[PDB]
Amino acid sequence: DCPSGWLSYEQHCYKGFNDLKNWTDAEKFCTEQKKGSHLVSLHSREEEKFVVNLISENLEYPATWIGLGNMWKDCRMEWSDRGNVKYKALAEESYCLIMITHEKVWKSMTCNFIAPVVCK
Amino acid sequence: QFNKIFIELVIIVDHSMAKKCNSTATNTKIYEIVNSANEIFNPLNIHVTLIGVEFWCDRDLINVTSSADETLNSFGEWRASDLMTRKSHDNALLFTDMRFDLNTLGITFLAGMCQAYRSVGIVQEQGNRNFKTAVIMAHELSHNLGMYHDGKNCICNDSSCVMSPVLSDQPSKLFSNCSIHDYQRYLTRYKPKCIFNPPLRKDIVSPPVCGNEIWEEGEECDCGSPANCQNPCCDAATCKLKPGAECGNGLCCYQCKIKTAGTVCRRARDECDVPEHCTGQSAECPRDQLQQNGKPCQNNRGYCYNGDCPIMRNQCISLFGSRANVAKDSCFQENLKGSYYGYCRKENGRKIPCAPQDVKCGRLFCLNNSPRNKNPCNMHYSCMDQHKGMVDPGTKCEDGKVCNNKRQCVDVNTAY
Amino acid sequence: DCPPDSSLYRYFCYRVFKEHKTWEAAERFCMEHPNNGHLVSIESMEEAEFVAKLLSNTTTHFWIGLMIKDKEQECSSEWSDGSSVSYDKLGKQEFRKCFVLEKESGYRMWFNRNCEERYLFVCKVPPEC
Numbered sequence: 001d002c003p004s005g006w007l008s009y010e011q012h013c014y015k016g017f018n019d020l021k022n023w024t025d026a027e028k029f030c031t032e033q034k035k036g037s038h039l040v041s042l043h044s045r046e047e048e049k050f051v052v053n054l055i056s057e058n059l060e061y062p063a064t065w066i067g068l069g070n071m072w073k074d075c076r077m078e079w080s081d082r083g084n085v086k087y088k089a090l091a092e093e094s095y096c097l098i099m100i101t102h103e104k105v106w107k108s109m110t111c112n113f114i115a116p117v118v119c120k
Numbered sequence: 121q122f123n124k125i126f127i128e129l130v131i132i133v134d135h136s137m138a139k140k141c142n143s144t145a146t147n148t149k150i151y152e153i154v155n156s157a158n159e160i161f162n163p164l165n166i167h168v169t170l171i172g173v174e175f176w177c178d179r180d181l182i183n184v185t186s187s188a189d190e191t192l193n194s195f196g197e198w199r200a201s202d203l204m205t206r207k208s209h210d211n212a213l214l215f216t217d218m219r220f221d222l223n224t225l226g227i228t229f230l231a232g233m234c235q236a237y238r239s240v241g242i243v244q245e246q247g248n249r250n251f252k253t254a255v256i257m258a259h260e261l262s263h264n265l266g267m268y269h270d271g272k273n274c275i276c277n278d279s280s281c282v283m284s285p286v287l288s289d290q291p292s293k294l295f296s297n298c299s300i301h302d303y304q305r306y307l308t309r310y311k312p313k314c315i316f317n318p319p320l321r322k323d324i325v326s327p328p329v330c331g332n333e334i335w336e337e338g339e340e341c342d343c344g345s346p347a348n349c350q351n352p353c354c355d356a357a358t359c360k361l362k363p364g365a366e367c368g369n370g371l372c373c374y375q376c377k378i379k380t381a382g383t384v385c386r387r388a389r390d391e392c393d394v395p396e397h398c399t400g401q402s403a404e405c406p407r408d409q410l411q412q413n414g415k416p417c418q419n420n421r422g423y424c425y426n427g428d429c430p431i432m433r434n435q436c437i438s439l440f441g442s443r444a445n446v447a448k449d450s451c452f453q454e455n456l457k458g459s460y461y462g463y464c465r466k467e468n469g470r471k472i473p474c475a476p477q478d479v480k481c482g483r484l485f486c487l488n489n490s491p492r493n494k495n496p497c498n499m500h501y502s503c504m505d506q507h508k509g510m511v512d513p514g515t516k517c518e519d520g521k522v523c524n525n526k527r528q529c530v531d532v533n534t535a536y
Numbered sequence: 537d538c539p540p541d542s543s544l545y546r547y548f549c550y551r552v553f554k555e556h557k558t559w560e561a562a563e564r565f566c567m568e569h570p571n572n573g574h575l576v577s578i579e580s581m582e583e584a585e586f587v588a589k590l591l592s593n594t595t596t597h598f599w600i601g602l603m604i605k606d607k608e609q610e611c612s613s614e615w616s617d618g619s620s621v622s623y624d625k626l627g628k629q630e631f632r633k634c635f636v637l638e639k640e641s642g643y644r645m646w647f648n649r650n651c652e653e654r655y656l657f658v659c660k661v662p663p664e665c
């Protein structure tokens with residue numbers, strides 16, 4: 001059982017928003033919304049298809065940020081010449097994940113992008 | 121003149137020449153080439169004593185390609201990993217039929233005599249033109265003793281000395297003005313220790329020859345040719361002892377009489393050497409033996425190795441001068457890349473990176489503190505001389521550990 | 537030194553090609569005729585400056601030789617809530633696991649790009665001897 005506005009599924013609470021904003025703002029946002037809230041997480045196509053319809057019914061835009069940001073910035077690396085990677089110079093730009101309603105798949109997009117949020 | 125020098129040589133006959141694996145004929149050709157070589161080296165007091173000969177009848181233990189540079193490199197790494205481990209010797213030559221590119225007849229490393237990976241040389245056998253082959257062998261061994269090619273004004277009586285960059289159809293048997301000087305310079309600089317005492321007569325495999333200034337089995341003595349012999353107790357011709365003399369040559373011979381037993385015939389050169397005393401039964405000093413490999417040396421700054429005490433700092437000085445020293449570990453990490461200069465072992469010319477535990481055995485990096493610099497990781501590399509620059513095998517890579525002859529930082533107790 | 541067609545920096549030579557290739561292709565091309573070659577590695581701020589000056593000295597984006605390990609798409613990242621990444625449906629073509637240098641950034645910033653995209657590159661080869 002979830003509060004007003006929020007829909008329930010399995011054991012969590014969901015809530016779509018049209019307030020378009022970048023990944024970080026979308027995250028900090030979800031937290032301020034409710035203690036323990038973060039961008040939606042998806043551990044199965046089942047939960048996914050649920051969040052999909054939640055969007056289609058409540059939200060205008062056919063997509064939302066999900067919950068993964070700065071995707072390939074803190075990985076284990078190495079140069080092709082087998083040399084070690086001590087020195088780093090990773091640009092501030094970075095990729096985050098978004099889910100498109102229709103094709104219901106995941107796309108990578110610069111976290112700069114402005115999209116609708118779907119807390120949980 | 122020069123001090124008597126002896127090169128304990130081992131010759132390798134590759135599959136090419138090993139086709140008709142049948143020895144006999146080959147050895148005869150070899151013995152004559154060698155003897156001829158000594159006849160060339162006489163005026164320099166250099167004596168090459170053949171203490172071994174191997175045949176590669178089965179296969180070629182290393183790929184003998186058309187590239188003389190490639191083959192030598194491969195041969196050098198083999199001579200260090202295989203041969204040296206099995207048989208003890210100073211230098212090693214590989215005799216082949218192989219028609220190398222660029223018309224080359226022989227190749228070796230500069231001032232490499234005594235060095236594990238670089239005391240090697242390649243020689244293309246000129247069929248049965250034995251003497252023309254001897255010149256090549258001489259031309260190389262000399263390059264290995266710091267001798268360069270004859271330039272603008274280097275003279276000899278034949279107008280075509282041994283060190284000419286081009287082998288004439290009737291090569292001289294004389295060394296040049298420049299060569300003599302280059303050699304003298306080699307000795308006062310590299311100070312080779314592995315070429316001072318000859319091998320026991322017992323171990324020389326070449327058929328005895330009187331007058332070759334090489335006391336061999338069957339010879340009563342040998343002060344060389346009657347021409348340049350100053351031995352009051354040896355027959356310059358018949359290699360026989362004069363009237364009242366027990367010996368002619370040997371560390372255990374004095375005033376022409378066999379030294380008494382218990383008398384030291386060969387002291388210990390360094391801390392990595394063990395003295396030898398006369399048996400009293402022969403004028404020939406017993407086989408030279410060095411300290412037990414592994415034994416600490418230089419106040420635990422290293423561990424003995426076939427007579428020497430290799431230490432990274434010194435090898436850095438050899439390469440970059442008195443102002444040089446070993447670089448900070450950080451540099452040796454370049455040896456993991458398996459770069460063109462940063463690697464350890466090589467397989468078929470292919471450079472293999474070092475396991476994180478053997479980085480102190482690949483390319484040596486020095487901190488040459490000489491102005492104009494900007495690189496704290498100096499290293500030596502030449503595609504024609506890649507082994508020089510690598511950490512000398514025997515070196516101490518860590519407390520209780522040393523590099524073996526296979527670019528590995530193994531445990532001293534297990535390396536010996 | 538190396539006067540084949542590149543610049544020299546501490547024992548290595550940097551050649552710059554104008555052929556558009558994929559990361560995979562570039563690396564593969566860096567280690568063929570220009571033997572031992574590889575895509576530029578940048579191990580220090582000094583070398584970083586060097587490669588930049590080189591690219592600036594040029595008359596698009598360039599392939600850095602940096603690559604990712606571990607067979608995990610997300611690497612070590614997890615959902616913002618804390619849960620591990622159970623379900624994963626990010627199409628492969630959505631990955632941006634390679635890195636390039638770009639003029640806008642002064643050739644001193646590493647940006648993620650699809651390893652399949654075709655950009656310019658710079659090999660770090662050995663010197664002539």
Ligand SMILES: *[C@@H]1O[C@H](CO)[C@@H](O[C@@H]2O[C@H](CO)[C@@H](O[C@@H]3O[C@H](CO[C@@H]4O[C@H](CO)[C@@H](O)[C@H](O)[C@@H]4O)[C@@H](O)[C@H](O)[C@@H]3O)[C@H](O)[C@H]2NC(C)=O)[C@H](O)[C@H]1NC(C)=O
Pocket residue numbers: 022023024025111112113
């Ligand atoms: C997602 O969007 C957010 C906001 O839209 C981006 O965050 C913003 O990032 C910039 C830096 O690129 C911050 O600017 C700095 O501001 C400080 C002054 O402090 C701030 O001042 C503003 C008003 O001036 C206040 O509203 C803030 O609360 C705070 O006090 C200044 O000293 C710096 O020189 C610099 O200009 C900006 O403050 C920040 N906005 C906030 C408050 O979130 C974010 O970059 C972007 N991220 C992604 C995923 O691209």
Ligand SMILES: *[C@@H]1O[C@H](CO)[C@@H](O[C@@H]2O[C@H](CO)[C@@H](O)[C@H](O)[C@H]2NC(C)=O)[C@H](O)[C@H]1NC(C)=O
Pocket residue numbers: 273274275297298301
């Ligand atoms: C070997 O001897 C030759 C000649 O005996 C030396 O060469 C001479 O070099 C001087 C340099 O000033 C010339 O002017 C002479 O003409 C050269 N001699 C001739 C006529 O050939 C040579 O220097 C000697 N080798 C060395 C360097 O020891």
Ligand SMILES: CNC(=O)[C@H](Cc1c[nH]c2ccccc12)NC(=O)[C@@H](CC(=O)NO)CC(C)C
Pocket residue numbers: 223224225226227228255256259260263284285286287
């Ligand atoms: C016929 N083969 C050879 O003797 C060639 C000849 C050669 C070299 N440069 C040339 C340019 C024009 C024509 C021929 C040659 N030279 C060699 O093999 C010499 C190689 C060398 O420098 N060894 O240290 C070692 C040798 C002197 C014993």
Ligand SMILES: *[C@@H]1O[C@H](CO)[C@@H](O)[C@H](O)[C@H]1NC(C)=O
Pocket residue numbers: 180181182183468
């Ligand atoms: C070179 O010789 C080695 C044996 O020492 C062999 O394994 C290798 O295959 C040879 N090279 C080639 C490519 O045939």
Ligand SMILES: *[C@@H]1O[C@H](CO)[C@@H](O)[C@H](O)[C@H]1NC(C)=O
Pocket residue numbers: 593
């Ligand atoms: C590269 O830069 C150097 C000076 O930094 C300059 O001399 C050279 O001409 C430049 N390359 C070319 C060919 O423009």
Ligand SMILES: [Ca+2]
Pocket residue numbers: 162165333344348
């Ligand atoms: Ca003599």
Ligand SMILES: [Ca+2]
Pocket residue numbers: 126127128209210314315316317
């Ligand atoms: Ca010896």
Ligand SMILES: [Ca+2]
Pocket residue numbers: 328329330331332333334335336339342
């Ligand atoms: Ca003799």
Ligand SMILES: [Ca+2]
Pocket residue numbers: 386387388393394395396408409410
């Ligand atoms: Ca001794």
Ligand SMILES: [Ca+2]
Pocket residue numbers: 614618619620
């Ligand atoms: Ca967790």
Ligand SMILES: [Zn+2]
Pocket residue numbers: 259263269285
């Ligand atoms: Zn030569």
